[PDB]
């Protein structure tokens, strides 16, 4: 499970578990843009079809 200090801080700062973010970088590294993508899909989610 690969992620730099800065990426780990961003995740922790926004209370994101690293296990629920799939990386897009080399060998599945988790990049800042992945934390940001997740944070953004997390807001759009409140408007997705469900029941």
């Amino acid at each position: 499970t690969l992620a730099t200090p800065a990426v780990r801080n961003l995740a922790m700062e926004n209370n994101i578990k690293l296990s629920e973010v799939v990386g897009s970088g080399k060998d599945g590294r988790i990049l800042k843009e992945d934390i940001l993508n997740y944070l953004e899909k997390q807001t759009l989610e409140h408007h997705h079809h469900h029941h």
Binding site: T4, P5, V7, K26, R29, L31, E33
Partner: protein, 472 residues
Amino acid sequence: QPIDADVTVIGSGPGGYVAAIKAAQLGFKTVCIEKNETLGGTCLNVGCIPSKALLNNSHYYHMAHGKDFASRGIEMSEVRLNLDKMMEQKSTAVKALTGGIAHLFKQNKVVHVNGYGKITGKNQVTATKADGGTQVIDTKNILIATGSEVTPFPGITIDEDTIVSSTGALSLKKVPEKMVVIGAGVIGVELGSVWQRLGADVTAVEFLGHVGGVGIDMEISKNFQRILQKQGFKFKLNTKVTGATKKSDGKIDVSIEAASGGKAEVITCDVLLVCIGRRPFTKNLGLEELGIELDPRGRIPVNTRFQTKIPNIYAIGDVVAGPMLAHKAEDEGIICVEGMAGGAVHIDYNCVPSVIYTHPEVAWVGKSEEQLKEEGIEYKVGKFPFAANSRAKTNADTDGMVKILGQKSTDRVLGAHILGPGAGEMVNEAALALEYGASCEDIARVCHAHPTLSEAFREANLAASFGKSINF
């Protein structure tokens, strides 16, 4: 005396000789065919190596002849140039490196065929030596690495005497009093700067509006140009050359005019260097008979595995698309040959670095500000000047800066541009950062040795990330 082989490589330039060595290391029965007296191609014989040598030597001559050394308390009586000796040091480097390739070929059991290669069949290459002595090679794969040649300038005819290409410029028998360079790209600037250092009065004439060729960052280019002019290097940009004529005294009248129109004038020189570019070399290789057509620029078309229209025939290096650089050709030769062993084949040209080995040096990798604006990418900018870098200051070598381009919101590094001391080496750290998809902050948190030039690289990234650096 025919020969069977798994991979036949035509050309021993950076692309050919590396692909050959590698093909052998992977178990392929490997033949490499080269028409010239020595291996190593354009880079080693008349390119990278001799120019870098002259760039080194002429730089030291400038330091000695000038104020640099004297400010350091190295007082030398009377500094004189011995051009022959200087050229000797250059040839020595070429000899050793070209000879070294023969050695590596022998060590890896690469079969070296000396003659002009022509593809005489979908699975056959024929080499014809000078004396007409022929040699046939039946092979599974053919790798075309036939490189590039000087692009001629219409009207002006190169004689490698007073009208020279890069090749003649690297072996002038005396410092020209006055020299004009047609083209202010990477290679023209380097060779121009060399002779300027040695005492030549030098002017480069360029049709476009900036020095340094395609992809260089506008601000980097402008600062570079400015510094070169301070050194005495002269430029006429947005200028066209209409012709040149040999006068009766031997000197040369070059006629120019604005690229837009008019302002027609005439500059006179002792030596004229035509340096407008290079182009793919495929002469008498037999592509026609094979039905392999070229693109409108002379390049052999290839897919992402470097295969041509004919699945077992491959091409790499200067002879195909992409940056015409030696490390690009080598990479291509490696991954192509890996592909023939069933490997994956992936290269991104946006990750290939460029360097100008002048002083200051210029190096960059990735995307320029202009390339970012025209792709509609949103970005931030961090800069750090070598003036505030400790090792640069301590050496009184303070021209230039590092400029980092980051994506505005993902902090992803998009490009890194260096003008100043140690740029060539420094850009490789940036290359590595790109491979890993580094963010500006990432580089900022990595411990860098102090005092080193590389801290300027660190600081620049810190400024891009945090908005502020520490020492500027």
